[PDB]
Structures are given as C-alpha cells and as structure tokens.
C-alpha cells in the first residue's frame, strides 16, 4: 500500500532553491491542515541541487536521486501520493543562452514525462510551477492570466513549452494539473548565480558586482516564502486546467535593486561594474494576481524585511555558499 | 538567393514524408522559378511515416541521409554548405499523440532546438520551421491572424507549439534567420493512409468501412499539398527572419460534408460509414487568415473538387504504394 494515515506529497526538484523551501515549510507544519506529512523529494542533483538544503528534514523526507524524464522510475515512485509539485527545471537565463539543450529536455520533455506518469498513477492534485517570463516583456501595466505567450529567451520558451504540454494533458485527459506563474524569487538557499545572491556574496567578499547593460531592466521581487504560500493556495483552492499568477511586491529597476542591496550590506557604488548587456534581455515583467488573491492568497513578507533576513542568512552561511562562489569564480 | 556554390543547395529535414517529399519533388522538377538544378539533401529518420518510395522519381538529384534531427553531431557535419534548411520532420498524427506523446515532444520540440542550434553554428542563411494551425486551439467564427495567442489543446498541437516557441526564441535571442509557417489540413498523393482523406479512399476502394467520429460537426480548412508547398516556397523567397506566415485552406468543411465529398468522389455509400463515439483530442474548428502571405504573392492553384479528384485517381492507380501501408495499419 503506497499511502497511510497522513498526506503524502511528492516534490520534484525539491533539493533546489524554491522546492527545498516548500519542503522545509511543509515539514515544519507551516501550512495548516498538512501536519505530519510524508514527503518524497525526487531530484537529479544538477549543479543547482543541494542536499544541504534538506539536511534538517530528513526524518520526514524520502529522497530519490533521479530524473523527471525517467518514466519507469516515476511509475514506481508516484503511486500513493496525494499531491505532486514540479519545481524541477533548468532555471538560469544566462545558462540557457549558452546552451539550451537541457532546458528543453528538463523543462518540456520532463513535464511530459511527469504528467504522463501522474495520469497513469491517478495523482489527484498536480502543480506545474512556472514563471512570468513566458509572457515576454511589458513596458507598462501588468499581465493577467489571459496574456499571450511570447517568450524571448530559450529558458522562457522552454518553461512555456512545459506549460503548454501540461495544459494539453488537462484539456485532453482531464489531468488535474494547475499552473502557477511567479515573479523573481529571492531568499535563503538561492544558488548564487541569480542576481541577489550573486551580488550579496560578492559584496561580502569585497568583490565587484556586474550590472548588465544600462541597469534599467525591471523585475518584480517576491520572497520565496510568499511564492510557496501562493503555491499552497493553488494546491488547496485552485482548479484543474487553470493558471494562477503570484505577483511580486517590489517592482524595481536593477539600478534601484542595486541601491537596496548596497544599503543592506553597507556597500559602495564603487563596487558596481557596468558590463555588456545580456542577449535578448527582457526589459520588464509585471503580473496581476487578482485571481489568486480572490482565493485568499496575500503576501506576508515586505521587501525590506525579507531582504534584511536574506542578507543575514548569506552573512551567516559562508559554509554553504563559499564553495559555490569558488566554483563559479 | 545567392547560393554558396554553383547551384543552390537545399536541406530538407523530414523530406521522406508526405509534405516534405512533395516539396522535394517540386523543387527538383523545376516548379519554383529561380530554383533549377538545385542540389538537395534530405535527412529523414524513416519512422513509420517515412517512405523512400515518395522520392523514387528524384533519386539521382537528392542525397538521402537516414538520420534524426535530434542528432546534433550528425547535423553539425551535414548542414554546412546549405543555403536553405526546411524542417518538415515531425510526429504528425493527433490520435497517435493521444496514445503516447513522448516522441511528439522529442521530435517536435527537442528536435527543433537541435536543428536551430546546429543551424546557428553552421551559419545557414534561411531556415523554415513548418508548423500547424492547431497551435491556436479552436475558433468558432472568423479566422486567426498571425498574432493569435498560442492555445493548443492536444499533445500534438502543444508539441508543435513548443517547437515554434523555441525557434522564435532563437530568432529573438541570437537573430537566427528562422521563419515559421502554419497551415491547416493537407491532402494529396503520397499521404500516409492514417489521415482521414487517404484512410477513407483506401478503405472505400477495398470495400471496407470508414469511421466517422462523434457528431461529425468538427470543421477543417483543406489545402492541397502542392499549394502548401508553394506557400512555403513563397516564405523561402519573400519572408523575413522571426516572422510567422499563415497558409490558408480554401475548402472549409464539416466532417459530415467531408464524408459526403469522399463518398461521392469514390462512388461509395453511407452504408460504409461506421458511426463511432467521439475521440479525445480533436478541436471544433480551425481557420487561418493568410492575407499576410497573399500580400507577398502567394495564391493557391488547386480547387478542392479538382484536387480531390486527382487524389482519388492517384490512389486508384497506386495500390502498389498504399496496399502494404493499409495492410499494416489493419
Ligand atoms: N528562481 C526564480 O526566481 C523563479 C521564478 C519563477 C519561477 N521559477 C520556477 O520555479 C522552479 C524552481 O526554481 P528554483 O529557483 O528553485 O530552481 P533551482 O535552479 O534553484 O533548482 C532546480 C532544481 O531542479 C533539479 N533538477 C533540474 N533538472 C532536473 C531533472 N531533469 N530531474 C530532476 N530534478 C531536476 C535541480 O537538481 C535543482 O535542485 C523552477 O520550475 C523555475 O522555473 C523560479
Ligand atoms: N499533414 C498535414 O495536414 C499538416 C498540416 C499542417 C502542418 N503539417 C506539418 O507539416 C510537417 C510535415 O507533415 P507531414 O504530413 O508530411 O508528416 P508525415 O507524418 O507524413 O511525415 C513526417 C516525416 O518526418 C520523419 N521524421 C519524424 N521524426 C523525425 C526525426 N526526429 N528526425 C528526422 N525525421 C523525422 C518521418 O520519417 C517522416 O518522413 C510536419 O511538421 C507537420 O506537423 C502537416
Ligand atoms: C545574474 C545577474 C543578473 N542581472 C540582471 C538580469 C535581470 O534583469 C535581473 C535578474 O536576473 P536573474 O537573477 O538572472 O533572473 P531572471 O533572468 O529570471 O530575471 O538582474 C544582472 O544585471 N547581473 C547579474 O549578474
């Protein structure tokens, strides 16, 4: 029998940044009505996967080192889980510009593999976690869930293809999959290739920070804990075949973000280097999340508070990030 | 076009299939003015749907390579020197995608990434990704322009849309000179007889039943393969990098109307039409507007009644080609 008297939750990509946050919160009892959960984490431990992100919750977590593209493995491990969440993906735009083959393999073929295995296993609730970048760029105003897909980068096009095959399963078979799309996340345990942890860890070592292009690109920032609470709202109250935005609550140019980061670590603008722009760089992302707010989601982490906590986290976790910075350097 | 060599050199992935082989046969025959004496490379993995018989008449003008568009190493050695790359390679049967879509995502998405990346490194100046009206979903009234949102419903359509999206991301990120075409249902000689028109023709010619699914009120816009290929060639000659181009169908028919036309065209009876329950992944209506490409000079030449009659005559005269295919399908 593959299920007992507590909920059983399957988290693909659960050794990464957002997925491990979701697992740690679920196990800690942060989501009401999900107490004493059994959690299965499936993660292939790419450069971004890190078992240190789960080291405190191994009594509740069954870890499976494997790939979402492995359909035989999924058929063996999925049965008995009440919820499947897919955080597994290649997620760095600059890596996708250098080589996108693994982005299409994991972010599209892997979604087909997981959705098909969920269909056969009868998993009753499935969440495909996705991104605002599938919409391209928006100069003014915000995207609602009806906005057309127009991805510009290979990462965003791969995420969009994954959403499209998941939605095709919902529409063709009645697969009970829901899509979430969110702004840029930040918080503890983010791999330090993304702009906030890269800038923080470099400033903490007295190194320079590389500001792409003219610095006027706009991102809408959300703390990972609010992203995961939005995802849990979708788990508990969303409907099959629907997309749900989870919006940021700090819309900043990269110049403004840089000012906030420098202020939070006592840094100086003399550390900021202008560097050539990213190819095809998206100018601006903005989401409206009225749809999910109507189901009771509300962010709890103001950017000033979340950034202060995140600076404190990186300041205290050199043991975790120094080996990652060393390799990337 | 300024060919790199003395004659143009055209690379056709999926050129042993239905539409791709028609394109090759027309190009070799000189049907496209300005493209005579071309050297043609056909790359095709010969799935259940590939057929070297489709290229029998152009054997001595075509270099055939049995290979997969996902084979980036092969593409890196075969692509250099080609002026144009056209990608007809795909899994294309909706009902097959309902049974198992894994190969649809592999060929129709990963295979497009593979081909675009190899084209980037090889410096190919003109690339055409052949795609489908099904990426837009269903439309109750009117026709889709090229700015219509992608909203595919079936696994086949979602896979084709995923391929278009990564192709367009290469156009936007690198300036890759790729163009996308989208078209409704094709028919004509050498179509594999799993598709509705050759399925009906070959079954009726053997005195067997033909299946009509559901209420039969699904609507499709039909185009003869030769007009589709001339639209594709218009995109080759007049299109622009990063742009989508529709090629419309000039016979809009319910499946009830299509069934009547097919029965009439072969002399069959409604007694042969087996009514069967609806199936899962077929949209209510597709319709494209092709004003954009018509402004670049495209115009269809085959009216449906004449093209259907030609196609019936072709299947009657080419049992040697389709009988093994029908036998295997059962
Ligand atoms: N980080 C953001 O700002 C952001 C914003 C919106 C959406 N998202 C989405 O949220 C998801 C998680 O993002 P993240 O920042 O935590 O990513 P991450 O890069 O920190 O971690 C990715 C995880 O996926 C694992 N993985 C990769 N490929 C796999 C495969 N084929 N099989 C199994 N595991 C695999 C990796 O080992 C790793 O643990 C992703 O789908 C991403 O697209 C992220
Ligand atoms: N048939 C239609 O009605 C129609 C309408 C609009 C668009 N299209 C598109 O036009 C293209 C051609 O369609 P068709 O009707 O000729 O398809 P088809 O089924 O007749 O032939 C597909 C060809 O692709 C080959 N192939 C498949 N996967 C391959 C791979 N990974 N590598 C190399 N070769 C591979 C097959 O061997 C075969 O020869 C496809 O992209 C299809 O999506 C078709
Ligand atoms: C990693 C990085 C990003 N950026 C910019 C690019 C984006 O506008 C923003 C966030 O980039 P990133 O963290 O890569 O996320 P995403 O591409 O998902 O938005 O910061 C830099 O200026 N420098 C850097 O070193």
mmCIF file of C-alpha atoms in Angstrom, chain A:
data_model
loop_
_atom_site.group_PDB
_atom_site.id
_atom_site.type_symbol
_atom_site.label_atom_id
_atom_site.label_comp_id
_atom_site.label_asym_id
_atom_site.label_seq_id
_atom_site.Cartn_x
_atom_site.Cartn_y
_atom_site.Cartn_z
ATOM 1 C CA UNK A 1 0.000 0.000 0.000
ATOM 2 C CA UNK A 2 1.538 3.303 -1.089
ATOM 3 C CA UNK A 3 -0.336 5.622 1.291
ATOM 4 C CA UNK A 4 -1.053 5.764 5.014
ATOM 5 C CA UNK A 5 -2.952 7.931 7.511
ATOM 6 C CA UNK A 6 -1.105 11.197 6.778
ATOM 7 C CA UNK A 7 -0.870 13.133 3.498
ATOM 8 C CA UNK A 8 1.841 12.059 1.048
ATOM 9 C CA UNK A 9 3.407 14.852 -1.021
ATOM 10 C CA UNK A 10 5.792 14.330 -3.960
ATOM 11 C CA UNK A 11 8.138 17.257 -4.712
ATOM 12 C CA UNK A 12 10.194 17.074 -7.904
ATOM 13 C CA UNK A 13 13.132 19.459 -7.811
ATOM 14 C CA UNK A 14 12.882 19.576 -4.009
ATOM 15 C CA UNK A 15 16.656 19.921 -3.494
ATOM 16 C CA UNK A 16 16.746 23.302 -5.265
ATOM 17 C CA UNK A 17 16.041 26.823 -4.034
ATOM 18 C CA UNK A 18 12.235 27.144 -4.122
ATOM 19 C CA UNK A 19 11.463 23.436 -3.883
ATOM 20 C CA UNK A 20 13.551 22.975 -0.746
ATOM 21 C CA UNK A 21 11.856 25.977 0.836
ATOM 22 C CA UNK A 22 8.476 24.389 0.139
ATOM 23 C CA UNK A 23 9.645 21.094 1.676
ATOM 24 C CA UNK A 24 11.119 22.731 4.783
ATOM 25 C CA UNK A 25 7.914 24.731 5.370
ATOM 26 C CA UNK A 26 5.635 21.736 4.750
ATOM 27 C CA UNK A 27 7.599 19.554 7.183
ATOM 28 C CA UNK A 28 7.724 22.359 9.774
ATOM 29 C CA UNK A 29 3.913 22.494 9.742
ATOM 30 C CA UNK A 30 3.631 25.984 8.244
ATOM 31 C CA UNK A 31 0.692 25.012 6.002
ATOM 32 C CA UNK A 32 -2.388 24.408 8.121
ATOM 33 C CA UNK A 33 -4.029 21.044 7.572
ATOM 34 C CA UNK A 34 -0.805 19.388 6.342
ATOM 35 C CA UNK A 35 0.633 18.027 9.605
ATOM 36 C CA UNK A 36 3.000 15.074 9.850
ATOM 37 C CA UNK A 37 3.156 14.813 6.068
ATOM 38 C CA UNK A 38 5.284 12.177 4.387
ATOM 39 C CA UNK A 39 7.349 13.888 1.672
ATOM 40 C CA UNK A 40 9.123 12.299 -1.285
ATOM 41 C CA UNK A 41 11.753 14.505 -2.955
ATOM 42 C CA UNK A 42 12.883 13.493 -6.437
ATOM 43 C CA UNK A 43 15.878 15.468 -7.640
ATOM 44 C CA UNK A 44 18.691 14.709 -10.085
ATOM 45 C CA UNK A 45 21.154 16.984 -8.229
ATOM 46 C CA UNK A 46 22.316 19.148 -11.105
ATOM 47 C CA UNK A 47 24.782 21.956 -10.378
ATOM 48 C CA UNK A 48 21.825 23.671 -8.633
ATOM 49 C CA UNK A 49 20.655 20.769 -6.454
ATOM 50 C CA UNK A 50 21.975 20.732 -2.914
ATOM 51 C CA UNK A 51 21.193 18.159 -0.222
ATOM 52 C CA UNK A 52 22.345 20.700 2.394
ATOM 53 C CA UNK A 53 19.045 22.453 1.608
ATOM 54 C CA UNK A 54 17.208 19.455 3.127
ATOM 55 C CA UNK A 55 19.595 18.342 5.871
ATOM 56 C CA UNK A 56 17.235 19.320 8.710
ATOM 57 C CA UNK A 57 14.153 17.475 7.436
ATOM 58 C CA UNK A 58 15.450 14.015 6.541
ATOM 59 C CA UNK A 59 13.169 12.332 9.117
ATOM 60 C CA UNK A 60 10.121 13.302 7.023
ATOM 61 C CA UNK A 61 11.701 13.242 3.556
ATOM 62 C CA UNK A 62 12.349 10.199 1.400
ATOM 63 C CA UNK A 63 14.996 11.301 -1.109
ATOM 64 C CA UNK A 64 15.170 9.715 -4.574
ATOM 65 C CA UNK A 65 18.153 10.735 -6.718
ATOM 66 C CA UNK A 66 16.688 10.592 -10.209
ATOM 67 C CA UNK A 67 15.357 12.463 -13.216
ATOM 68 C CA UNK A 68 11.794 13.539 -14.003
ATOM 69 C CA UNK A 69 12.445 12.220 -17.539
ATOM 70 C CA UNK A 70 12.787 8.667 -16.118
ATOM 71 C CA UNK A 71 9.296 7.347 -16.758
ATOM 72 C CA UNK A 72 9.998 3.917 -15.274
ATOM 73 C CA UNK A 73 11.173 5.493 -12.020
ATOM 74 C CA UNK A 74 8.140 7.788 -11.844
ATOM 75 C CA UNK A 75 5.775 4.844 -12.403
ATOM 76 C CA UNK A 76 7.431 3.116 -9.432
ATOM 77 C CA UNK A 77 7.584 6.068 -7.032
ATOM 78 C CA UNK A 78 4.478 8.167 -7.776
ATOM 79 C CA UNK A 79 1.695 5.753 -6.646
ATOM 80 C CA UNK A 80 0.111 6.748 -3.355
ATOM 81 C CA UNK A 81 0.954 10.459 -3.372
ATOM 82 C CA UNK A 82 -1.892 12.909 -2.835
ATOM 83 C CA UNK A 83 -0.099 15.906 -4.384
ATOM 84 C CA UNK A 84 2.692 16.272 -6.952
ATOM 85 C CA UNK A 85 4.560 19.567 -7.298
ATOM 86 C CA UNK A 86 7.114 20.104 -10.073
ATOM 87 C CA UNK A 87 9.933 22.504 -9.172
ATOM 88 C CA UNK A 88 12.474 20.596 -11.284
ATOM 89 C CA UNK A 89 13.893 22.758 -14.082
ATOM 90 C CA UNK A 90 16.912 24.422 -15.594
ATOM 91 C CA UNK A 91 16.353 27.995 -14.418
ATOM 92 C CA UNK A 92 19.224 30.393 -15.266
ATOM 93 C CA UNK A 93 18.632 32.549 -18.352
ATOM 94 C CA UNK A 94 22.361 33.046 -18.992
ATOM 95 C CA UNK A 95 22.982 29.295 -18.981
ATOM 96 C CA UNK A 96 20.075 28.898 -21.420
ATOM 97 C CA UNK A 97 21.705 31.408 -23.764
ATOM 98 C CA UNK A 98 24.985 29.462 -23.671
ATOM 99 C CA UNK A 99 23.358 26.040 -24.198
ATOM 100 C CA UNK A 100 19.624 25.357 -24.106
ATOM 101 C CA UNK A 101 19.556 21.597 -24.825
ATOM 102 C CA UNK A 102 18.987 20.638 -21.168
ATOM 103 C CA UNK A 103 16.379 23.392 -20.788
ATOM 104 C CA UNK A 104 14.168 21.796 -23.427
ATOM 105 C CA UNK A 105 14.868 18.307 -22.081
ATOM 106 C CA UNK A 106 14.000 19.042 -18.443
ATOM 107 C CA UNK A 107 11.535 21.901 -18.812
ATOM 108 C CA UNK A 108 9.488 20.363 -21.670
ATOM 109 C CA UNK A 109 10.194 16.628 -22.101
ATOM 110 C CA UNK A 110 10.407 16.221 -18.324
ATOM 111 C CA UNK A 111 6.984 17.818 -17.970
ATOM 112 C CA UNK A 112 5.511 15.363 -20.492
ATOM 113 C CA UNK A 113 7.147 12.532 -18.550
ATOM 114 C CA UNK A 114 5.816 13.681 -15.174
ATOM 115 C CA UNK A 115 2.316 14.496 -16.442
ATOM 116 C CA UNK A 116 2.007 11.133 -18.194
ATOM 117 C CA UNK A 117 3.155 9.288 -15.078
ATOM 118 C CA UNK A 118 0.719 11.323 -12.963
ATOM 119 C CA UNK A 119 -2.096 10.377 -15.351
ATOM 120 C CA UNK A 120 -1.419 6.646 -15.078
ATOM 121 C CA UNK A 121 -0.873 6.821 -11.304
ATOM 122 C CA UNK A 122 -4.083 8.802 -10.715
ATOM 123 C CA UNK A 123 -2.425 11.568 -8.678
ATOM 124 C CA UNK A 124 -5.380 13.807 -7.701
ATOM 125 C CA UNK A 125 -3.636 17.217 -7.474
ATOM 126 C CA UNK A 126 -0.680 18.350 -9.609
ATOM 127 C CA UNK A 127 1.077 21.748 -9.685
ATOM 128 C CA UNK A 128 3.418 22.737 -12.516
ATOM 129 C CA UNK A 129 5.476 25.674 -11.222
ATOM 130 C CA UNK A 130 6.269 28.260 -13.915
ATOM 131 C CA UNK A 131 7.337 31.851 -14.497
ATOM 132 C CA UNK A 132 6.199 35.279 -15.662
ATOM 133 C CA UNK A 133 8.931 35.185 -18.326
ATOM 134 C CA UNK A 134 6.696 33.159 -20.654
ATOM 135 C CA UNK A 135 4.884 36.429 -21.488
ATOM 136 C CA UNK A 136 7.948 38.249 -22.879
ATOM 137 C CA UNK A 137 8.237 41.889 -21.791
ATOM 138 C CA UNK A 138 5.677 44.574 -20.859
ATOM 139 C CA UNK A 139 6.518 48.284 -20.849
ATOM 140 C CA UNK A 140 3.593 49.483 -18.702
ATOM 141 C CA UNK A 141 0.858 47.753 -16.755
ATOM 142 C CA UNK A 142 0.610 44.123 -15.743
ATOM 143 C CA UNK A 143 -0.181 40.720 -17.219
ATOM 144 C CA UNK A 144 -3.314 38.810 -16.281
ATOM 145 C CA UNK A 145 -3.687 35.078 -16.847
ATOM 146 C CA UNK A 146 -5.117 35.687 -20.343
ATOM 147 C CA UNK A 147 -1.916 37.308 -21.646
ATOM 148 C CA UNK A 148 -0.467 35.641 -24.759
ATOM 149 C CA UNK A 149 2.672 33.560 -24.535
ATOM 150 C CA UNK A 150 5.578 35.361 -26.207
ATOM 151 C CA UNK A 151 8.818 34.121 -24.592
ATOM 152 C CA UNK A 152 12.069 35.709 -25.755
ATOM 153 C CA UNK A 153 14.828 33.624 -24.126
ATOM 154 C CA UNK A 154 15.451 29.895 -24.502
ATOM 155 C CA UNK A 155 14.710 29.469 -20.788
ATOM 156 C CA UNK A 156 11.364 31.233 -21.097
ATOM 157 C CA UNK A 157 10.443 29.312 -24.264
ATOM 158 C CA UNK A 158 11.264 26.023 -22.534
ATOM 159 C CA UNK A 159 9.152 26.929 -19.497
ATOM 160 C CA UNK A 160 6.327 27.931 -21.878
ATOM 161 C CA UNK A 161 6.526 24.624 -23.756
ATOM 162 C CA UNK A 162 6.249 22.797 -20.448
ATOM 163 C CA UNK A 163 3.147 24.772 -19.531
ATOM 164 C CA UNK A 164 1.639 24.033 -22.934
ATOM 165 C CA UNK A 165 2.041 20.257 -22.699
ATOM 166 C CA UNK A 166 0.750 20.265 -19.092
ATOM 167 C CA UNK A 167 -2.323 22.247 -20.179
ATOM 168 C CA UNK A 168 -2.803 19.881 -23.135
ATOM 169 C CA UNK A 169 -2.953 16.978 -20.667
ATOM 170 C CA UNK A 170 -5.533 18.864 -18.596
ATOM 171 C CA UNK A 171 -7.674 19.556 -21.652
ATOM 172 C CA UNK A 172 -7.258 16.190 -23.390
ATOM 173 C CA UNK A 173 -7.416 13.747 -20.448
ATOM 174 C CA UNK A 174 -8.813 15.789 -17.583
ATOM 175 C CA UNK A 175 -5.433 15.639 -15.862
ATOM 176 C CA UNK A 176 -5.855 17.602 -12.601
ATOM 177 C CA UNK A 177 -2.864 19.901 -13.167
ATOM 178 C CA UNK A 178 -2.719 23.584 -12.194
ATOM 179 C CA UNK A 179 -0.091 26.088 -13.448
ATOM 180 C CA UNK A 180 1.489 28.805 -11.314
ATOM 181 C CA UNK A 181 3.465 31.744 -12.733
ATOM 182 C CA UNK A 182 5.510 33.976 -10.431
ATOM 183 C CA UNK A 183 7.907 36.913 -10.429
ATOM 184 C CA UNK A 184 11.594 36.767 -9.477
ATOM 185 C CA UNK A 185 12.199 34.995 -6.154
ATOM 186 C CA UNK A 186 14.817 35.770 -3.526
ATOM 187 C CA UNK A 187 15.615 34.362 -0.099
ATOM 188 C CA UNK A 188 17.795 31.897 1.821
ATOM 189 C CA UNK A 189 19.393 28.962 -0.052
ATOM 190 C CA UNK A 190 19.222 30.544 -3.541
ATOM 191 C CA UNK A 191 22.111 29.388 -5.730
ATOM 192 C CA UNK A 192 24.459 32.399 -6.034
ATOM 193 C CA UNK A 193 24.218 32.772 -9.811
ATOM 194 C CA UNK A 194 20.957 34.740 -9.515
ATOM 195 C CA UNK A 195 21.349 38.499 -9.164
ATOM 196 C CA UNK A 196 20.545 38.997 -5.468
ATOM 197 C CA UNK A 197 22.709 36.182 -4.006
ATOM 198 C CA UNK A 198 25.452 36.829 -6.567
ATOM 199 C CA UNK A 199 25.606 40.498 -5.597
ATOM 200 C CA UNK A 200 25.365 39.784 -1.853
ATOM 201 C CA UNK A 201 28.065 37.087 -1.777
ATOM 202 C CA UNK A 202 30.414 39.124 -3.962
ATOM 203 C CA UNK A 203 29.941 42.277 -1.848
ATOM 204 C CA UNK A 204 30.524 40.265 1.329
ATOM 205 C CA UNK A 205 33.935 39.276 -0.086
ATOM 206 C CA UNK A 206 34.697 42.850 -1.174
ATOM 207 C CA UNK A 207 34.375 41.953 -4.860
ATOM 208 C CA UNK A 208 32.741 43.806 -7.743
ATOM 209 C CA UNK A 209 29.139 43.225 -8.848
ATOM 210 C CA UNK A 210 28.325 43.051 -12.599
ATOM 211 C CA UNK A 211 25.386 45.272 -13.592
ATOM 212 C CA UNK A 212 24.095 44.219 -17.021
ATOM 213 C CA UNK A 213 23.665 46.841 -19.705
ATOM 214 C CA UNK A 214 22.059 50.120 -18.644
ATOM 215 C CA UNK A 215 20.585 48.739 -15.415
ATOM 216 C CA UNK A 216 17.046 49.902 -16.280
ATOM 217 C CA UNK A 217 15.501 46.444 -16.641
ATOM 218 C CA UNK A 218 12.605 45.918 -14.233
ATOM 219 C CA UNK A 219 11.839 42.872 -12.101
ATOM 220 C CA UNK A 220 9.055 42.397 -9.554
ATOM 221 C CA UNK A 221 10.509 40.704 -6.485
ATOM 222 C CA UNK A 222 8.782 38.186 -4.205
ATOM 223 C CA UNK A 223 10.203 36.372 -1.188
ATOM 224 C CA UNK A 224 10.354 32.588 -1.652
ATOM 225 C CA UNK A 225 8.101 32.081 1.384
ATOM 226 C CA UNK A 226 5.283 34.084 -0.232
ATOM 227 C CA UNK A 227 5.750 32.221 -3.531
ATOM 228 C CA UNK A 228 5.357 28.929 -1.678
ATOM 229 C CA UNK A 229 2.286 30.180 0.191
ATOM 230 C CA UNK A 230 0.754 31.119 -3.164
ATOM 231 C CA UNK A 231 1.552 27.639 -4.477
ATOM 232 C CA UNK A 232 -0.097 26.118 -1.411
ATOM 233 C CA UNK A 233 -3.165 28.279 -2.063
ATOM 234 C CA UNK A 234 -3.273 26.772 -5.553
ATOM 235 C CA UNK A 235 -2.937 23.262 -4.060
ATOM 236 C CA UNK A 236 -5.838 23.814 -1.674
ATOM 237 C CA UNK A 237 -8.192 26.038 -3.690
ATOM 238 C CA UNK A 238 -7.203 26.039 -7.360
ATOM 239 C CA UNK A 239 -8.924 24.207 -10.183
ATOM 240 C CA UNK A 240 -7.709 21.780 -12.847
ATOM 241 C CA UNK A 241 -6.527 23.359 -16.083
ATOM 242 C CA UNK A 242 -6.203 26.878 -14.652
ATOM 243 C CA UNK A 243 -3.222 29.256 -14.472
ATOM 244 C CA UNK A 244 -2.612 31.338 -11.332
ATOM 245 C CA UNK A 245 -0.318 34.340 -11.094
ATOM 246 C CA UNK A 246 1.663 35.021 -7.929
ATOM 247 C CA UNK A 247 2.809 38.606 -8.202
ATOM 248 C CA UNK A 248 5.860 40.380 -6.912
ATOM 249 C CA UNK A 249 5.531 43.174 -4.364
ATOM 250 C CA UNK A 250 8.669 45.212 -5.073
ATOM 251 C CA UNK A 251 8.915 46.475 -8.648
ATOM 252 C CA UNK A 252 12.482 47.734 -9.081
ATOM 253 C CA UNK A 253 14.868 48.613 -11.841
ATOM 254 C CA UNK A 254 18.151 46.789 -11.490
ATOM 255 C CA UNK A 255 19.711 50.156 -10.555
ATOM 256 C CA UNK A 256 17.159 50.534 -7.750
ATOM 257 C CA UNK A 257 17.710 46.927 -6.662
ATOM 258 C CA UNK A 258 21.452 47.591 -6.572
ATOM 259 C CA UNK A 259 20.862 50.589 -4.271
ATOM 260 C CA UNK A 260 18.809 48.397 -1.904
ATOM 261 C CA UNK A 261 21.499 45.698 -1.872
ATOM 262 C CA UNK A 262 24.321 48.183 -1.272
ATOM 263 C CA UNK A 263 22.375 49.807 1.579
ATOM 264 C CA UNK A 264 21.641 46.432 3.191
ATOM 265 C CA UNK A 265 25.324 45.361 3.297
ATOM 266 C CA UNK A 266 26.866 48.804 3.811
ATOM 267 C CA UNK A 267 28.419 48.647 0.340
ATOM 268 C CA UNK A 268 29.513 51.379 -2.054
ATOM 269 C CA UNK A 269 28.708 52.177 -5.679
ATOM 270 C CA UNK A 270 32.451 51.906 -6.350
ATOM 271 C CA UNK A 271 31.884 48.119 -6.337
ATOM 272 C CA UNK A 272 29.354 48.265 -9.196
ATOM 273 C CA UNK A 273 30.707 47.444 -12.675
ATOM 274 C CA UNK A 274 28.753 48.184 -15.825
ATOM 275 C CA UNK A 275 29.082 45.153 -18.095
ATOM 276 C CA UNK A 276 27.729 44.309 -21.567
ATOM 277 C CA UNK A 277 24.019 43.561 -21.745
ATOM 278 C CA UNK A 278 22.515 40.077 -21.786
ATOM 279 C CA UNK A 279 21.439 38.887 -25.242
ATOM 280 C CA UNK A 280 17.715 39.435 -25.791
ATOM 281 C CA UNK A 281 17.405 40.759 -22.195
ATOM 282 C CA UNK A 282 13.773 41.176 -21.160
ATOM 283 C CA UNK A 283 13.050 44.810 -20.279
ATOM 284 C CA UNK A 284 10.232 44.370 -17.757
ATOM 285 C CA UNK A 285 7.989 41.780 -16.070
ATOM 286 C CA UNK A 286 4.790 42.625 -14.180
ATOM 287 C CA UNK A 287 1.945 40.358 -13.049
ATOM 288 C CA UNK A 288 -1.524 40.948 -11.694
ATOM 289 C CA UNK A 289 -2.501 38.301 -9.132
ATOM 290 C CA UNK A 290 -6.112 39.359 -8.534
ATOM 291 C CA UNK A 291 -7.281 35.839 -9.450
ATOM 292 C CA UNK A 292 -5.312 34.088 -6.705
ATOM 293 C CA UNK A 293 -5.925 36.877 -4.182
ATOM 294 C CA UNK A 294 -9.638 36.174 -4.656
ATOM 295 C CA UNK A 295 -8.880 32.662 -3.342
ATOM 296 C CA UNK A 296 -7.279 34.117 -0.206
ATOM 297 C CA UNK A 297 -3.599 34.456 -1.076
ATOM 298 C CA UNK A 298 -1.843 37.502 0.342
ATOM 299 C CA UNK A 299 1.916 38.120 0.601
ATOM 300 C CA UNK A 300 3.302 38.334 4.127
ATOM 301 C CA UNK A 301 6.934 39.426 3.606
ATOM 302 C CA UNK A 302 7.628 43.109 2.858
ATOM 303 C CA UNK A 303 10.710 43.505 0.684
ATOM 304 C CA UNK A 304 12.650 45.491 3.294
ATOM 305 C CA UNK A 305 12.066 42.774 5.891
ATOM 306 C CA UNK A 306 12.718 39.876 3.524
ATOM 307 C CA UNK A 307 15.899 41.466 2.196
ATOM 308 C CA UNK A 308 17.184 42.080 5.725
ATOM 309 C CA UNK A 309 16.541 38.407 6.561
ATOM 310 C CA UNK A 310 18.203 37.293 3.344
ATOM 311 C CA UNK A 311 21.309 39.431 3.950
ATOM 312 C CA UNK A 312 21.529 37.976 7.458
ATOM 313 C CA UNK A 313 21.197 34.469 6.012
ATOM 314 C CA UNK A 314 24.028 34.848 3.476
ATOM 315 C CA UNK A 315 26.162 36.621 6.082
ATOM 316 C CA UNK A 316 25.848 33.606 8.389
ATOM 317 C CA UNK A 317 26.064 30.854 5.770
ATOM 318 C CA UNK A 318 29.526 31.171 4.264
ATOM 319 C CA UNK A 319 29.899 27.424 4.829
ATOM 320 C CA UNK A 320 27.036 26.903 2.370
ATOM 321 C CA UNK A 321 27.849 29.474 -0.325
ATOM 322 C CA UNK A 322 31.668 29.789 -0.307
ATOM 323 C CA UNK A 323 32.194 26.502 -2.230
ATOM 324 C CA UNK A 324 29.560 27.595 -4.757
ATOM 325 C CA UNK A 325 31.137 31.050 -5.207
ATOM 326 C CA UNK A 326 34.566 29.423 -5.523
ATOM 327 C CA UNK A 327 33.422 27.210 -8.402
ATOM 328 C CA UNK A 328 31.534 29.989 -10.202
ATOM 329 C CA UNK A 329 34.621 32.209 -9.880
#
